[PDB]
Amino acid sequence: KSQQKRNRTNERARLRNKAVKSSLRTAVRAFREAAHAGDKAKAAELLASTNRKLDKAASKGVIHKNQAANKKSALAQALNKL
Amino acid sequence: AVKIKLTRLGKIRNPQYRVAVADARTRRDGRAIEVIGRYHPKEEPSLIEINSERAQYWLSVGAQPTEPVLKLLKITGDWQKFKGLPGAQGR
Amino acid sequence: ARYTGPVTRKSRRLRTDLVGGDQAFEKRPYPPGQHGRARIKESEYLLQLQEKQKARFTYGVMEKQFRRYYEEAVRQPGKTGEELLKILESRLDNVIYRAGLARTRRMARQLVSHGHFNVNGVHVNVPSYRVSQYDIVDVRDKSLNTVPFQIARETAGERPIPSWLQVVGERQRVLIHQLPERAQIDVPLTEQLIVEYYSK
RNA sequence: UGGAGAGUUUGAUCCUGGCUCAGGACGAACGCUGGCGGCGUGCUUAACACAUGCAAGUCGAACGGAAAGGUCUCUUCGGAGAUACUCGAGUGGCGAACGGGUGAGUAACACGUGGGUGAUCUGCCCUGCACUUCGGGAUAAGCCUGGGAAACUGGGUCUAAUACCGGAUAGGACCACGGGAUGCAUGUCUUGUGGUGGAAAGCGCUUUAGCGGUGUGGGAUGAGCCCGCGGCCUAUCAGCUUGUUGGUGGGGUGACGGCCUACCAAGGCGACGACGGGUAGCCGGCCUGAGAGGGUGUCCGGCCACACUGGGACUGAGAUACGGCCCAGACUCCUACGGGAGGCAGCAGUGGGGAAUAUUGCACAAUGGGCGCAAGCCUGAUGCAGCGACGCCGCGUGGGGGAUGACGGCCUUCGGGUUGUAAACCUCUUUCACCAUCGACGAAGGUCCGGGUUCUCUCGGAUUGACGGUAGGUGGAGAAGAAGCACCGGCCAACUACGUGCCAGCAGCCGCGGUAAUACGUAGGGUGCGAGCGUUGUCCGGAAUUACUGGGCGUAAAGAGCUCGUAGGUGGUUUGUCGCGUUGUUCGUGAAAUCUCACGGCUUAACUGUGAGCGUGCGGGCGAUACGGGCAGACUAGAGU
Ligand SMILES: [Mg+2]
Ligand SMILES: [Mg+2]
Ligand SMILES: [Mg+2]
Ligand SMILES: [Mg+2]
Ligand SMILES: [Mg+2]
Ligand SMILES: [Mg+2]
Ligand SMILES: [Mg+2]
Ligand SMILES: [Mg+2]
Ligand SMILES: [Mg+2]
Ligand SMILES: [Mg+2]
Ligand SMILES: [Mg+2]
Ligand SMILES: [Mg+2]
Ligand SMILES: [Mg+2]
Ligand SMILES: [Mg+2]
Ligand SMILES: [Mg+2]
Ligand SMILES: [Mg+2]
Ligand SMILES: [Mg+2]
Ligand SMILES: [Mg+2]
Ligand SMILES: [Mg+2]
Ligand SMILES: [Mg+2]
Ligand SMILES: [Mg+2]
Ligand SMILES: [Mg+2]
Ligand SMILES: [Mg+2]
Ligand SMILES: [Mg+2]
Ligand SMILES: [Mg+2]
Ligand SMILES: [Mg+2]
Ligand SMILES: [Mg+2]
Ligand SMILES: [Mg+2]
Ligand SMILES: [Mg+2]
Ligand SMILES: [Mg+2]
Ligand SMILES: [Mg+2]
Ligand SMILES: [Mg+2]
Ligand SMILES: [Mg+2]
Ligand SMILES: [Mg+2]
Ligand SMILES: [Mg+2]
Ligand SMILES: [Mg+2]
Ligand SMILES: [Mg+2]
Ligand SMILES: [Mg+2]
Ligand SMILES: [Mg+2]
Ligand SMILES: [Mg+2]
Ligand SMILES: [Mg+2]
Ligand SMILES: [Mg+2]
Ligand SMILES: [Mg+2]
Ligand SMILES: [Mg+2]
Ligand SMILES: [Mg+2]
Ligand SMILES: [Mg+2]
Ligand SMILES: [Mg+2]
Ligand SMILES: [Mg+2]
Ligand SMILES: [Mg+2]
Ligand SMILES: [Mg+2]
Ligand SMILES: [Mg+2]
Ligand SMILES: [Mg+2]
Ligand SMILES: [Mg+2]
Ligand SMILES: [Mg+2]
Ligand SMILES: [Mg+2]
């Protein structure tokens, strides 16, 4: 069949993408909890950190540029309205 | 990628081929994007017919013909005209 | 297939001789069978069937080929029976018969089937071939000086030549100026009954 | 450019009205018979289960290593040496989402058609603007062990990368503020300002051997999504819905959206048939019919849906992911009982069902597809071959004189005639068969050389066809090797005799057979077709017996028992406006093959190529208000008071 190599590369991809996605999720929830805390001081830099992580993931290709733009806009408006 | 390929529509012992522009991910005898000539390998030398301007447009837009369509283009000179080569006809 | 049977029996059944030649008549009336001397009521379908069979056995045409000829004739614009007769005449055996290169239609079919004619210098062996305008017909060079041809080479001047065909001398070549007109040359049979037969 | 009727109710007639017939068609079967070639077609039933072989691999010009080949290499005299072309296995890249199969499910935006995407994504292809710059860590493979019957797996080292991670800088990422144009409302296209950020990779070279990657502009290509119109039966299915309908705020998607979520309203669908039941892949197409129409979706082409049954995720540009993965169920198999493996609705083939449908063949010779710089590799796609009269076409089974009225048979008025010029006898031709030979086009094609330095070109030296020594041609004696089939009472073409005597029997109807049967079995004779002829199965037509074309309702079947009135259909005269229906032109579209005209090529036809019709329609612009219609009015005749 010569697809055992494909299966191994697949599972390597699952681990890599799952790890980066979970890291991005944790960063997003950190920024969110800062947003409800309303410190408005460290949230300003957490926004930039989250944007950097998310568009780094987009460049890596684990996500799409459209999703990266949507999430960045959401977090920016989130910081804005408070 | 867009390709220019020969489509066979003759009978069992009359393999007539049509010079057509079709998508690569299609069957040989399928619905091509546009037919831009034909080729009959049953005459004495052959029967070669090329529009020579729709082929030029497709070549400039990115269409890539296969080996026999490339040979026919070289024969008709349209490939040479597109690439800027001196000899525009070698029939 | 081919009939390959008694032509005179068919002629007596049809009540109209259509072959002539050396064996034109049997010197007797036409009781085709055991009861053939008795009178029979003439039905409408009988006349049309007899006309169609007369044409088919005159031109050596099978039933399916005759059906195709009739359907092509009616599909063609203008008339139907005239076109059918023209198609029937356009056969190689009929052309040879009219040009007088054979004794009858059966002889013409025998020669053309055995392949003793090259139309455009090309060997053919099908009587079903149809001639067209500006088309030549020639005799095989090897097949010359043979008995079945030399027997008629000198006695082919008896039968008339149609107004659309022409014959050449010592070296025969057959050329087709235009399509024939059976309505004015050799029409012993009315096609207006066949056209009614084939619409039933 | 195209319209046939006949039989059958009665003592006899005319209507109405059934039933039957004559014709064609098929992915066909049966009975009998049966030569060949050209081209096509061939599990329609069990989406029943499968033995077996082949159907997706490639790159050393990305990388570490050397299992094999020839190898210079030490030399064993049968052992050594990755450094070398080359390469087992391994990392990595791409492909694998295409190609091939079935029509199960599906009455659905699944399909056909025409719009919208200011709601979108898009590898490999083309191409504009630039870069191609710095560090780090492990591991595959190998080696040493361990566990397990296997399927498989653990621990310890060890080596890379065009593998991974972390970096500098880069605007079509975002936010806020603006400029400039646009309308179709959310908006759309392009710059500026301030705050944010986001990648790349190196390898090879007979020295112009070549490859690459990314940051993004714009094309080409493929697709995701929405809408109007059209294509079954059933009301003996009349009330359906609650994320259901909408809104708001978030979440989610490439993208709009109850797609998901929290809150608010009570709404949304239904007699123009929802909801429910039965059935079904849709279309271009195919058959019949003069046509309208009726039937049908098989070859082929387009799409859709599915891959033992049911469910789910991931990789990836892109997944019903047949030959990928996870789980539940059934089945089959191995087992050491602890555990494992599997899915022909791919090609070929087997079992079973059925009236029934084919080789476990050849080759990548050509085309398409995938991998490289390539040379090259794979391809049951494809090109063929093999079996079947299964369908279309075509040719033969001979022909020239023959009244010996052969002999005979048959009928028989005992005179005759039919078989019947067909025969014998004289003769001509060898179409296709048999034997031998030559021998293809399909290949202005691909490799190793000569001008060209590589880009382009012809030249020849060599080779490359499964088909195939095949088509086809030639040479040889010989009519010599070659026909059968159905019917004969009316429909409908075809009559005598023998045996039989309501018995044997036939038959589509109505009718024949109970002792002179053109209707039964048989013999002769005739009719029609032909390597085919009849039966069965189904559809169309006749049937104007579901009638728009193209029917009727006093007595033949047909006016509700009457009235009112909901929806609906339909509507007086006249004026003005719109131009929706109507109609004209123009543009786009209406795929190809197939249907037709006209031609061209297979000796002809079937088959095939080309030009034009077809595609009855739809969207857009531009003309008309003659009629219907919308609106604005007016009149009295209709109608009402
Ligand atoms: Mg965590
Ligand atoms: Mg968003
Ligand atoms: Mg035939
Ligand atoms: Mg009647
Ligand atoms: Mg009476
Ligand atoms: Mg009565
Ligand atoms: Mg009447
Ligand atoms: Mg690989
Ligand atoms: Mg290797
Ligand atoms: Mg590559
Ligand atoms: Mg892939
Ligand atoms: Mg697939
Ligand atoms: Mg099936
Ligand atoms: Mg189905
Ligand atoms: Mg639609
Ligand atoms: Mg290790
Ligand atoms: Mg940066
Ligand atoms: Mg990098
Ligand atoms: Mg809710
Ligand atoms: Mg909402
Ligand atoms: Mg179905
Ligand atoms: Mg009719
Ligand atoms: Mg399923
Ligand atoms: Mg199965
Ligand atoms: Mg399943
Ligand atoms: Mg990919
Ligand atoms: Mg993905
Ligand atoms: Mg699945
Ligand atoms: Mg797969
Ligand atoms: Mg399979
Ligand atoms: Mg198969
Ligand atoms: Mg059976
Ligand atoms: Mg059986
Ligand atoms: Mg190949
Ligand atoms: Mg190829
Ligand atoms: Mg049979
Ligand atoms: Mg009769
Ligand atoms: Mg008797
Ligand atoms: Mg009888
Ligand atoms: Mg009928
Ligand atoms: Mg009708
Ligand atoms: Mg009536
Ligand atoms: Mg009465
Ligand atoms: Mg009555
Ligand atoms: Mg009444
Ligand atoms: Mg009553
Ligand atoms: Mg009553
Ligand atoms: Mg009303
Ligand atoms: Mg009204
Ligand atoms: Mg009016
Ligand atoms: Mg009205
Ligand atoms: Mg021709
Ligand atoms: Mg068309
Ligand atoms: Mg218009
Ligand atoms: Mg009044």
Side-chain angles (χ1 to χ4, degrees):
Chain A
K1 322 187 314 151
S2 310
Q3 217 194 349
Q4 309 90 4
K5 183 167 180 167
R6 271 294 194 182
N7 299 341
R8 298 185 278 275
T9 54
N10 280 6
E11 49 92 3
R12 281 156 205 141
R14 286 93 149 114
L15 283 296
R16 178 218 153 140
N17 296 247
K18 212 286 172 213
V20 59
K21 278 164 84 46
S22 92
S23 74
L24 199 297
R25 284 197 264 249
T26 46
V28 165
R29 316 308 156 190
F31 175 81
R32 215 59 74 84
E33 61 74 17
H36 333 94
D39 49 52
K40 231 54 200 192
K42 62 183 189 93
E45 72 97 13
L46 250 199
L47 180 126
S49 100
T50 310
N51 276 353
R52 201 218 175 224
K53 297 329 142 184
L54 173 75
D55 79 328
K56 273 179 55 56
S59 177
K60 271 163 171 179
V62 313
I63 71 159
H64 200 261
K65 299 188 175 175
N66 289 174
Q67 321 157 11
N70 285 285
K71 307 256 224 193
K72 290 206 307 193
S73 157
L75 51 88
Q77 201 278 120
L79 184 79
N80 286 13
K81 79 292 169 199
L82 298 326
Chain B
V2 194
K3 317 282 281 299
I4 318 190
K5 44 171 84 154
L6 290 185
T7 323
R8 158 162 171 171
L9 313 89
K11 67 146 82 70
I12 169 183
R13 266 164 263 271
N14 294 68
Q16 267 94 22
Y17 297 97
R18 265 192 199 162
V19 177
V21 170
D23 206 305
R25 315 175 302 273
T26 64
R27 48 218 314 279
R28 166 171 59 73
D29 45 342
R31 180 209 198 97
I33 323 170
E34 175 161 309
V35 168
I36 57 161
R38 51 178 189 145
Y39 161 76
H40 296 13
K42 282 283 279 259
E43 325 306 348
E44 322 80 52
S46 66
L47 190 100
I48 295 167
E49 198 266 293
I50 303 284
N51 219 315
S52 187
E53 85 275 357
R54 265 300 172 277
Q56 190 99 331
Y57 153 76
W58 280 112
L59 285 180
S60 41
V61 98
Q64 308 275 348
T66 61
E67 62 290 3
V69 186
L70 195 35
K71 280 312 160 179
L72 299 186
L73 263 279
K74 289 176 187 322
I75 289 158
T76 199
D78 197 21
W79 210 85
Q80 281 93 342
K81 309 167 184 97
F82 155 68
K83 265 309 173 191
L85 313 178
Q89 227 298 333
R91 184 254 166 268
Chain C
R2 192 143 78 68
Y3 174 43
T4 74
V7 153
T8 36
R9 267 272 323 276
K10 294 267 187 274
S11 286
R12 283 161 53 208
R13 182 48 66 179
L14 300 164
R15 314 294 275 286
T16 312
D17 292 18
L18 49 94
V19 286
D22 205 301
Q23 286 170 15
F25 198 36
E26 202 63 21
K27 328 154 308 301
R28 86 165 331 284
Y30 300 162
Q34 154 173 147
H35 295 80
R37 216 172 322 257
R39 51 215 152 248
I40 173 148
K41 162 224 58 184
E42 192 53 50
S43 68
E44 167 77 19
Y45 194 44
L46 190 54
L47 298 140
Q48 314 186 336
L49 179 58
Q50 277 172 357
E51 253 68 69
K52 171 168 123 304
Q53 295 301 121
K54 286 182 208 171
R56 261 179 82 251
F57 296 137
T58 305
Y59 280 71
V61 183
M62 276 189 305
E63 184 52 49
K64 284 178 162 63
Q65 189 170 199
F66 199 80
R67 256 269 306 296
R68 298 190 48 88
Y69 288 164
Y70 149 77
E71 68 175 338
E72 173 170 10
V74 55
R75 174 246 303 267
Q76 281 336 108
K79 217 141 282 290
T80 69
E82 311 319 308
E83 261 80 6
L84 165 60
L85 289 194
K86 176 225 60 65
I87 292 165
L88 292 164
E89 287 261 323
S90 49
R91 296 242 322 244
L92 298 209
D93 44 34
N94 178 91
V95 163
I96 288 320
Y97 193 29
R98 301 313 178 91
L101 265 68
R103 186 178 144 282
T104 70
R105 295 265 178 65
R106 273 206 174 181
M107 305 55 256
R109 181 179 193 84
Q110 180 161 113
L111 308 172
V112 70
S113 322
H114 284 188
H116 299 254
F117 295 100
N118 280 28
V119 281
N120 273 258
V122 56
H123 197 147
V124 307
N125 64 305
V126 298
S128 161
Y129 195 102
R130 276 190 294 167
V131 312
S132 159
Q133 86 293 331
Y134 206 5
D135 214 358
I136 54 194
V137 182
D138 206 294
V139 198
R140 299 231 85 198
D141 37 35
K142 207 283 310 171
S143 165
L144 309 166
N145 314 50
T146 191
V147 170
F149 287 17
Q150 288 331 284
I151 289 323
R153 269 287 326 283
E154 67 284 73
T155 40
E158 316 153 5
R159 284 201 289 101
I161 294 323
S163 40
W164 62 281
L165 251 171
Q166 101 284 358
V167 194
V168 180
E170 280 254 283
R171 247 281 302 297
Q172 278 82 336
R173 327 175 93 267
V174 190
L175 292 75
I176 315 298
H177 258 257
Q178 48 167 344
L179 279 163
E181 317 92 356
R182 208 204 186 229
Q184 301 123 9
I185 321 95
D186 205 350
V187 56
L189 198 175
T190 306
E191 49 275 47
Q192 220 82 354
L193 285 197
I194 292 102
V195 308
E196 297 157 20
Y197 177 102
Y198 262 107
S199 290
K200 162 191 241 164

